[PDB]
Scaffold this active site. Structure first.
Site, PDB file in Angstrom:
ATOM      1  N   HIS A  40       0.812  -1.221   0.000  1.00 27.27           N
ATOM      2  CA  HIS A  40       0.000   0.000   0.000  1.00 27.27           C
ATOM      3  C   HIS A  40       0.846   1.273   0.000  1.00 27.27           C
ATOM      4  CE1 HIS A  40       0.389  -0.022   4.524  1.00 27.27           C
ATOM      5  NE2 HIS A  40       0.347   1.287   4.338  1.00 27.27           N
ATOM      6  N   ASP A  84       0.254  -7.707   1.767  1.00 28.59           N
ATOM      7  CA  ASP A  84       0.681  -6.303   1.763  1.00 28.59           C
ATOM      8  C   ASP A  84       2.206  -6.238   1.871  1.00 28.59           C
ATOM      9  OD1 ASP A  84       0.625  -3.534   1.770  1.00 28.59           O
ATOM     10  OD2 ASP A  84      -0.058  -3.347   3.834  1.00 28.59           O
ATOM     11  N   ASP A 171       1.325   1.960  19.922  1.00 30.82           N
ATOM     12  CA  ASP A 171       0.974   1.393  18.621  1.00 30.82           C
ATOM     13  C   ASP A 171       1.755   2.134  17.534  1.00 30.82           C
ATOM     14  OD1 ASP A 171      -0.384  -0.225  16.715  1.00 30.82           O
ATOM     15  OD2 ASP A 171      -2.326   0.708  17.051  1.00 30.82           O
ATOM     16  N   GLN A 174      -0.206   6.387  11.448  1.00 25.99           N
ATOM     17  CA  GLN A 174      -0.093   6.918  10.094  1.00 25.99           C
ATOM     18  C   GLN A 174       1.322   7.430   9.834  1.00 25.99           C
ATOM     19  OE1 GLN A 174      -3.047   9.880   9.090  1.00 25.99           O
ATOM     20  NE2 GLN A 174      -2.297  10.093   6.987  1.00 25.99           N
ATOM     21  N   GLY A 175       1.903   7.018   8.707  1.00 25.63           N
ATOM     22  CA  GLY A 175       3.268   7.380   8.389  1.00 25.63           C
ATOM     23  C   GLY A 175       4.310   6.365   8.818  1.00 25.63           C
ATOM     24  N   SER A 177       3.657   3.176   8.127  1.00 26.36           N
ATOM     25  CA  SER A 177       3.413   2.225   7.040  1.00 26.36           C
ATOM     26  C   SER A 177       4.699   1.773   6.375  1.00 26.36           C
ATOM     27  CB  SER A 177       2.523   2.888   5.968  1.00 26.36           C
ATOM     28  OG  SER A 177       1.170   2.999   6.375  1.00 26.36           O
ATOM     29  N   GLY A 178       4.814   0.461   6.155  1.00 22.50           N
ATOM     30  CA  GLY A 178       5.938  -0.108   5.444  1.00 22.50           C
ATOM     31  C   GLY A 178       7.132  -0.413   6.320  1.00 22.50           C
TER      32      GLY A 178
HETATM   33  N1  6SO Z   1      -1.058   0.576  13.632  1.00 21.07           N
HETATM   34  C1  6SO Z   1      -0.823   1.501  12.501  1.00 21.07           C
HETATM   35  C2  6SO Z   1      -1.754   1.088  11.385  1.00 21.07           C
HETATM   36  C3  6SO Z   1      -1.771   2.000  10.200  1.00 21.07           C
HETATM   37  C4  6SO Z   1      -1.159   1.821   8.995  1.00 21.07           C
HETATM   38  N2  6SO Z   1      -1.442   2.868   8.161  1.00 21.07           N
HETATM   39  C5  6SO Z   1      -2.279   3.739   8.807  1.00 21.07           C
HETATM   40  C6  6SO Z   1      -2.847   4.933   8.374  1.00 21.07           C
HETATM   41  C7  6SO Z   1      -3.668   5.606   9.244  1.00 21.07           C
HETATM   42  C8  6SO Z   1      -3.898   5.104  10.528  1.00 21.07           C
HETATM   43 CL1  6SO Z   1      -4.942   6.002  11.601  1.00 21.07          CL
HETATM   44  C9  6SO Z   1      -3.345   3.935  10.979  1.00 21.07           C
HETATM   45  C10 6SO Z   1      -2.514   3.224  10.098  1.00 21.07           C
END
Ligand code: 6SO
Ligand code: CA
Length: 223
Positions: A40, A84, A171, A174-175, A177-178
């Protein structure tokens, strides 16, 4: 990363930033010419940035290298996020040293209860927004498959695992990712998805890298 700590400059030497005029995704260096990330995160015009701590300041250990080819998994499904995972080849080999280094692929899958390290430059707040400039870290365990499936009914495939805290507060976000999930010195996960960040009973979901080692190895050998 929500609820984490400042890693320290270049203490996560396999962490890369994917840049398209701005940081947009993380990734992991697996050898001198290949990066693994989330499917993604795909886009054209990617520059891979190695040796980063502050992504807005040139501090002296960076290597900036353009991608020459990207390969999304052949069975990636963008609606369910199953499979993914994506590979990125660098136009030239990175120079490996103590601050830029590859991370080993796993020979076996990690078990629930294993402690892992998750890292990235993503949002640090669960409500609202604050993006850090330096790399943040989080230690978190792999959760059992039953707890993961009970938290996300009907959404967890055999290519996913949950890691984190059912209580919330810590956790990836956003950002992130990857980015990498490293356990016992091996790359076991990729930051993939979740419901928000750090919410109660909604841990992060990660791509299960051990399922893809054969595909990774064959792809690198022929490209
Ligand atoms: N645990 C992180 C999961 C995750 C991956 N891309 C995201 C984009 C937006 C939000 Cl709010 C969360 C995520
Ligand atoms: Ca920098």
């Amino acid at each position: 990363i929500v609820g984490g700590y400042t890693c320290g400059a270049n203490t996560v030497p396999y962490q890369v930033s994917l840049n398209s005029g701005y940081h947009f995704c993380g990734g992991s260096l697996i050898n001198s010419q290949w990066v693994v990330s989330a499917a993604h995160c795909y886009k054209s015009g990617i520059q891979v940035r190695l040796g980063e701590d502050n992504i807005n300041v040139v501090e002296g250990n960076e290597q900036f290298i353009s991608a020459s080819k990207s390969i999304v998994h052949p069975s990636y499904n963008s609606n369910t996020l199953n499979n993914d995972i994506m590979l990125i080849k660098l136009k030239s080999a990175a120079s490996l040293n103590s601050r830029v280094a590859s991370i080993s692929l796993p020979t076996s899958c990690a078990s629930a209860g294993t402690q892992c390290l998750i890292s990235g430059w993503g949002n640090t707040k669960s409500s609202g927004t604050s993006y850090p400039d330096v790399l943040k870290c989080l230690k978190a365990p792999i959760l059992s498959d039953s707890s993961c499936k009970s938290a996300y009914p009907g959404q967890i495939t055999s290519n996913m695992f949950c890691a984190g805290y059912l209580e919330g507060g810590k956790d990836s976000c956003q950002g992130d990712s990857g980015g990498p999930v490293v356990c016992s010195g091996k790359l076991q996960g990729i930051v993939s998805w979740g419901s928000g960040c750090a919410q109660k009973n909604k841990p992060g979901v990660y791509t299960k890298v051990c399922n893809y080692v054969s595909w990774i190895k064959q792809t690198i050998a022929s490209n």
